[PDB]
């Protein structure tokens, strides 16, 4: 009765249904993503690239493009290099 043939696994179809209900994160204008960035470094001084992507809900290449112009990466000897939201 085990390893019964099936067209697709339940978890897989559930994940595809969720992925197609939510869809891709839509690219937005520069000012509004910058507004999320402003709320972001108002909320907390330091950040991790993944959490910033989750909060902003923006394409990773577009986030990197809009963050490199104003932000810089600071090397740390404790865990990993990370981005800085301060323009200076």
């Amino acid at each position: 009765t085990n390893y019964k043939p099936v067209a697709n696994h339940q978890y897989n179809i559930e994940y595809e249904r969720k992925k197609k209900e939510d869809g891709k994160r839509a690219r937005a204008d520069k000012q509004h993503v910058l507004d999320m960035l402003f709320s972001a470094f108002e909320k907390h001084q330091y950040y991790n690239l993944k959490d910033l992507v989750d909060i902003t809900k923006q394409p990773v290449v577009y986030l990197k493009e809009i963050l490199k112009e104003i932000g810089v990466q600071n090397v740390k000897g404790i865990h990993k290099n990370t981005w800085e939201l301060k323009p200076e």
Binding site: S39, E42, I70, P87
Partner: protein, 75 residues
């Protein structure tokens, strides 16, 4: 969020204003009018005047007013 976000907005606004050829200095209220920051706090104002527009190398202090620094940069 307060006391840390609008500094980026004002510096960007004055930089872009200088990009249009506005060499003349502008008062703080002049920028505040068009930046939709009429509800800015007084302590924010004095903190700006005492630190933000004097510590950065991109703002020039002349005849009391504040302007760009095109001499420092290459043109």
């Amino acid at each position: 969020g307060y006391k840390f976000g609008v500094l980026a907005k004002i510096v960007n606004y004055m930089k872009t204003r200088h990009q249009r050829g506005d060499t003349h200095p502008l008062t703080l209220d002049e920028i505040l009018d068009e930046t939709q920051h009429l509800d800015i706090g007084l302590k924010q104002k004095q903190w700006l005047m005492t630190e933000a527009l004097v510590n950065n190398p991109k703002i020039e202090v002349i005849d009391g007013k504040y302007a760009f620094k095109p001499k420092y940069n290459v043109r």
